[PDB]
Enzyme design. Structure first.
Site, PDB file in Angstrom:
ATOM      1  N   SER B 144      -4.892  -7.738   1.525  1.00  0.00           N
ATOM      2  CA  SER B 144      -6.100  -7.503   0.736  1.00  0.00           C
ATOM      3  C   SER B 144      -7.318  -7.661   1.649  1.00  0.00           C
ATOM      4  O   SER B 144      -7.262  -8.391   2.637  1.00  0.00           O
ATOM      5  CB  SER B 144      -6.155  -8.496  -0.426  1.00  0.00           C
ATOM      6  OG  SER B 144      -7.437  -8.559  -1.018  1.00  0.00           O
ATOM      7  N   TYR B 158      -5.860 -16.391  -4.347  1.00  0.00           N
ATOM      8  CA  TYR B 158      -5.423 -15.041  -4.028  1.00  0.00           C
ATOM      9  C   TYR B 158      -5.660 -14.718  -2.559  1.00  0.00           C
ATOM     10  O   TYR B 158      -4.760 -14.205  -1.894  1.00  0.00           O
ATOM     11  CB  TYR B 158      -6.112 -14.022  -4.936  1.00  0.00           C
ATOM     12  CG  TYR B 158      -5.739 -12.570  -4.682  1.00  0.00           C
ATOM     13  CD1 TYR B 158      -4.529 -12.042  -5.157  1.00  0.00           C
ATOM     14  CD2 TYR B 158      -6.605 -11.721  -3.977  1.00  0.00           C
ATOM     15  CE1 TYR B 158      -4.186 -10.710  -4.935  1.00  0.00           C
ATOM     16  CE2 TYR B 158      -6.281 -10.383  -3.753  1.00  0.00           C
ATOM     17  CZ  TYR B 158      -5.069  -9.886  -4.237  1.00  0.00           C
ATOM     18  OH  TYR B 158      -4.746  -8.572  -4.016  1.00  0.00           O
ATOM     19  N   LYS B 162      -2.683 -13.696   0.444  1.00  0.00           N
ATOM     20  CA  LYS B 162      -2.628 -12.513   1.313  1.00  0.00           C
ATOM     21  C   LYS B 162      -2.933 -12.808   2.792  1.00  0.00           C
ATOM     22  O   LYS B 162      -2.452 -12.086   3.674  1.00  0.00           O
ATOM     23  CB  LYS B 162      -3.538 -11.400   0.787  1.00  0.00           C
ATOM     24  CG  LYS B 162      -3.235 -10.952  -0.649  1.00  0.00           C
ATOM     25  CD  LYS B 162      -1.767 -10.606  -0.867  1.00  0.00           C
ATOM     26  CE  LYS B 162      -1.514 -10.060  -2.277  1.00  0.00           C
ATOM     27  NZ  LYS B 162      -1.949  -8.645  -2.421  1.00  0.00           N
TER      28      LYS B 162
HETATM   29  N1  LIG Z   1      -6.267  -2.847  -6.981  1.00  0.00           N
HETATM   30  C1  LIG Z   1      -7.014  -3.387  -6.020  1.00  0.00           C
HETATM   31  O1  LIG Z   1      -8.352  -3.217  -5.976  1.00  0.00           O
HETATM   32  C2  LIG Z   1      -6.305  -4.203  -4.950  1.00  0.00           C
HETATM   33  C3  LIG Z   1      -7.077  -4.764  -3.927  1.00  0.00           C
HETATM   34  C4  LIG Z   1      -6.482  -5.518  -2.919  1.00  0.00           C
HETATM   35  C5  LIG Z   1      -5.106  -5.706  -2.939  1.00  0.00           C
HETATM   36  N2  LIG Z   1      -4.316  -5.142  -3.966  1.00  0.00           N
HETATM   37  C6  LIG Z   1      -2.847  -5.369  -3.932  1.00  0.00           C
HETATM   38  O2  LIG Z   1      -2.113  -4.105  -4.011  1.00  0.00           O
HETATM   39  C7  LIG Z   1      -0.879  -4.335  -4.757  1.00  0.00           C
HETATM   40  C8  LIG Z   1      -0.815  -3.490  -6.046  1.00  0.00           C
HETATM   41  O3  LIG Z   1      -2.040  -3.596  -6.781  1.00  0.00           O
HETATM   42  P1  LIG Z   1      -2.317  -2.799  -8.148  1.00  0.00           P
HETATM   43  O4  LIG Z   1      -3.779  -2.649  -8.266  1.00  0.00           O
HETATM   44  O5  LIG Z   1      -1.465  -1.593  -8.160  1.00  0.00           O
HETATM   45  O6  LIG Z   1      -1.811  -3.865  -9.258  1.00  0.00           O
HETATM   46  P2  LIG Z   1      -1.406  -3.506 -10.796  1.00  0.00           P
HETATM   47  O7  LIG Z   1      -2.041  -2.256 -11.257  1.00  0.00           O
HETATM   48  O8  LIG Z   1      -1.602  -4.739 -11.603  1.00  0.00           O
HETATM   49  O9  LIG Z   1       0.169  -3.246 -10.637  1.00  0.00           O
HETATM   50  C9  LIG Z   1       1.055  -4.337 -10.397  1.00  0.00           C
HETATM   51  C10 LIG Z   1       2.417  -3.821  -9.901  1.00  0.00           C
HETATM   52  O10 LIG Z   1       3.223  -4.960  -9.460  1.00  0.00           O
HETATM   53  C11 LIG Z   1       4.454  -4.926 -10.177  1.00  0.00           C
HETATM   54  N3  LIG Z   1       4.909  -6.300 -10.417  1.00  0.00           N
HETATM   55  C12 LIG Z   1       4.235  -7.290 -11.025  1.00  0.00           C
HETATM   56  N4  LIG Z   1       4.996  -8.383 -11.059  1.00  0.00           N
HETATM   57  C13 LIG Z   1       6.156  -8.088 -10.470  1.00  0.00           C
HETATM   58  C14 LIG Z   1       7.321  -8.801 -10.209  1.00  0.00           C
HETATM   59  N5  LIG Z   1       7.427 -10.072 -10.574  1.00  0.00           N
HETATM   60  N6  LIG Z   1       8.337  -8.186  -9.572  1.00  0.00           N
HETATM   61  C15 LIG Z   1       8.245  -6.911  -9.199  1.00  0.00           C
HETATM   62  N7  LIG Z   1       7.152  -6.196  -9.433  1.00  0.00           N
HETATM   63  C16 LIG Z   1       6.101  -6.761 -10.060  1.00  0.00           C
HETATM   64  C17 LIG Z   1       4.103  -4.277 -11.519  1.00  0.00           C
HETATM   65  O11 LIG Z   1       5.267  -3.735 -12.130  1.00  0.00           O
HETATM   66  P3  LIG Z   1       5.712  -4.177 -13.611  1.00  0.00           P
HETATM   67  O12 LIG Z   1       4.542  -3.739 -14.622  1.00  0.00           O
HETATM   68  O13 LIG Z   1       7.027  -3.593 -13.953  1.00  0.00           O
HETATM   69  O14 LIG Z   1       5.726  -5.774 -13.636  1.00  0.00           O
HETATM   70  C18 LIG Z   1       3.150  -3.170 -11.082  1.00  0.00           C
HETATM   71  O15 LIG Z   1       3.862  -2.017 -10.620  1.00  0.00           O
HETATM   72  C19 LIG Z   1      -0.872  -5.824  -5.104  1.00  0.00           C
HETATM   73  O16 LIG Z   1      -0.211  -6.538  -4.057  1.00  0.00           O
HETATM   74  C20 LIG Z   1      -2.345  -6.196  -5.113  1.00  0.00           C
HETATM   75  O17 LIG Z   1      -2.490  -7.592  -4.839  1.00  0.00           O
HETATM   76  C21 LIG Z   1      -4.923  -4.387  -4.987  1.00  0.00           C
END
Ligand SMILES: NC(=O)c1ccc[n+]([C@@H]2O[C@H](COP(=O)([O-])OP(=O)(O)OC[C@H]3O[C@@H](n4cnc5c(N)ncnc54)[C@H](OP(=O)(O)O)[C@@H]3O)[C@@H](O)[C@H]2O)c1
Ligand SMILES: NC(=O)c1ccc[n+]([C@@H]2O[C@H](COP(=O)([O-])OP(=O)(O)OC[C@H]3O[C@@H](n4cnc5c(N)ncnc54)[C@H](OP(=O)(O)O)[C@@H]3O)[C@@H](O)[C@H]2O)c1
Ligand SMILES: O=c1oc2cc(O)ccc2c2oc3cc(O)ccc3c12
Ligand SMILES: O=c1oc2cc(O)ccc2c2oc3cc(O)ccc3c12
Lengths: 260, 261
Positions: B144, B158, B162
């Site tokens: 992140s 958080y 990361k």
């Molecule tokens: N969005 C941002 O601005 C941002 C910024 C920095 C970093 N990130 C990182 O990028 C990654 C994805 O972010 P996102 O925005 O796509 O998040 P999101 O929209 O909340 O999606 C979360 C994903 O993680 C899966 N997940 C959650 N718990 C899980 C578990 N216990 N085992 C396996 N899968 C699990 C969920 O699947 P299910 O619904 O089936 O649980 C879903 O596909 C994360 O690591 C997040 O920290 C995101």
């Protein structure tokens, strides 16, 4: 008043019964602070650190608490305050080291390391914020291997200190509402029991060198041609936790004698 | 017939790829020619859709349920991927959860909730990838921009979760070298997903008193390019890292924030 001194201040150091922690505790005592000395196992070594702080003309107490247990960190901090009246400085120092190729690292080894080095430090910081007086100091402990030095088979430990690096930068934002500064010291090879534990892992074919030869090779890492000692880390913690060190805040200081 | 940047013959696995960044990655790798293993923990219906999306563009995919917090379920997920498709070449560790709270309020349980997935989970995904992957494989973990490049109040848990990933990948690349596997992380900034709308207010000075649309508009102004980050932007980079041509990017964390930092 004397600049760099801590007269009338109360400090706490985790795992200060031996190694770096011991040097930090004694040095904080030399600077005028009364000191809470924490250990998990090293009772006699801790009682001995207590003696030295008293021998310099300060006051100290030894309190047994296992920093892996959050209820124990809380109890440690509660007991510190109830004994000395207040707490100004918290140094999170307790840690363990680990080596292993990614392919062999177990669930148990991960948990052994992170429970102390990361989770432990994280909640020592929490309890410190909760208990400290306005204008206090918190110092956590990282590693030159966190960011600055890359060693094979060292992923778990490196990662555990990488969290601490990010922790202190954000902690400084939150802890500012009580005018508390949060920093981390990141030592390189420093001569303690930990050093002798894993020095062979930091050197190509380390097994084929004596313990002394490894210490000499480590000394040549720094362009100053000497080893890092616990006093070197103490010296810096001393400055960080002084009135003068205030403008260093939310930073990680690598202390490797210029090795990186 | 070898096209630079394509992944014909390759097999990829993306954790948490039923929705969010991971879905775009999984779909994208499929478009590049890879066969994909789509992982979910809760979003069954969405995972099915991703599978269908990957099949409709001329590739193959399977949906496997596995809680990434459970290490024995990581082992099984990787065992099944190799079992179904024959081999595994690419593993993208994407699954993550966000968290906010002043340090003084962070509980043991919240600490464990975040670290068991974002850090411990990703660690053991990486381990299972090295064990199962083919010579010359690829491993991408998700960090992140807050880990190191961006500093937000009440975001310590958080960020640290990361920051650990950042050191992991650098050293992973040393260990993984003997199977000629490269290991990296992508560190996205504000990227428009469910996660984004769920917490955009914690990133803006009293974002409580702006709409959900208004906050997305304000995140777009963080980049000098004046747009938001989208899941496709991450997919585009992951796509390069896991190709043949991205081999010399190794043990690195790539912040993907449109130049906000
Ligand atoms: N969005 C941002 O601005 C941002 C910024 C920095 C970093 N990130 C990182 O990028 C990654 C994805 O972010 P996102 O925005 O796509 O998040 P999101 O929209 O909340 O999606 C979360 C994903 O993680 C899966 N997940 C959650 N718990 C899980 C578990 N216990 N085992 C396996 N899968 C699990 C969920 O699947 P299910 O619904 O089936 O649980 C879903 O596909 C994360 O690591 C997040 O920290 C995101
Ligand atoms: N030595 C180096 O070259 C080096 C380099 C980089 C970073 N560091 C960091 O510096 C810090 C201190 O290292 P060191 O050289 O002093 O290591 P050390 O000589 O092995 O001492 C470790 C200290 O941690 C304490 N400790 C261990 N488990 C504990 C627990 N469960 N609860 C409370 N305390 C516990 C030990 O106390 P007990 O004996 O009572 O268990 C001891 O005081 C560690 O965080 C280490 O990662 C050291
Ligand atoms: O940088 C280091 O970090 C360490 C951290 C520890 O906890 C223990 C030992 C070391 C250590 O041993 C070495 C030997 C060398 O020849 C060069 C560097 C190091 C080195
Ligand atoms: O950098 C960010 O990372 C995020 C990560 C998330 O998961 C959700 C939202 C954001 C987010 O919202 C913002 C608003 C701004 O005005 C500037 C930066 C950001 C920003």
């Amino acid at each position: 008043y004397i600049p760099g001194r801590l007269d009338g201040k109360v400090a706490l150091v985790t795992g200060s019964g031996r190694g770096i922690g011991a040097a930090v505790a004694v040095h904080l005592g030399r600077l005028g602070a009364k000191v809470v000395v924490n250990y998990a196992n090293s009772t006699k070594d801790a009682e001995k650190v207590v003696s030295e702080i008293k021998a310099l003309g300060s006051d100290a107490i030894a309190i047994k608490a296992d920093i892996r247990q959050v209820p124990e960190i809380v109890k440690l901090f509660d007991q510190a305050v109830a004994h000395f009246g207040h707490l100004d400085i918290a140094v999170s120092n307790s840690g363990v080291v680990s080596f292993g190729h990614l392919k062999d690292v177990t669930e148990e080894e991960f948990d052994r390391v992170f429970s102390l080095n990361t989770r432990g430090q994280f909640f020592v910081a929490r309890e410190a914020y909760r208990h400290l007086t306005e204008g206090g100091r918190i110092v956590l402990t990282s590693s030159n291997t966190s960011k600055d030095f890359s060693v094979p088979k060292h992923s778990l430990y490196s990662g555990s200190k990488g969290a601490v690096d990010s922790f202190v930068r954000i902690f400084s934002k939150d802890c500012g509402d009580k005018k508390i500064t949060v920093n981390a010291v990141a030592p390189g090879g420093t001569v303690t029991d930990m050093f002798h534990e894993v020095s062979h892992h930091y050197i190509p074919n380390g097994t084929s060198y004596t313990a002394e030869q490894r210490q000499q090779m480590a000394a040549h890492a720094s362009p100053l041609h000497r080893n890092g000692w616990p006093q070197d880390v103490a010296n810096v913690v001393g400055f960080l936790v002084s009135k003068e060190g205030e403008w260093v805040n939310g930073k990680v200081l690598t202390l490797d004698g210029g090795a990186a």
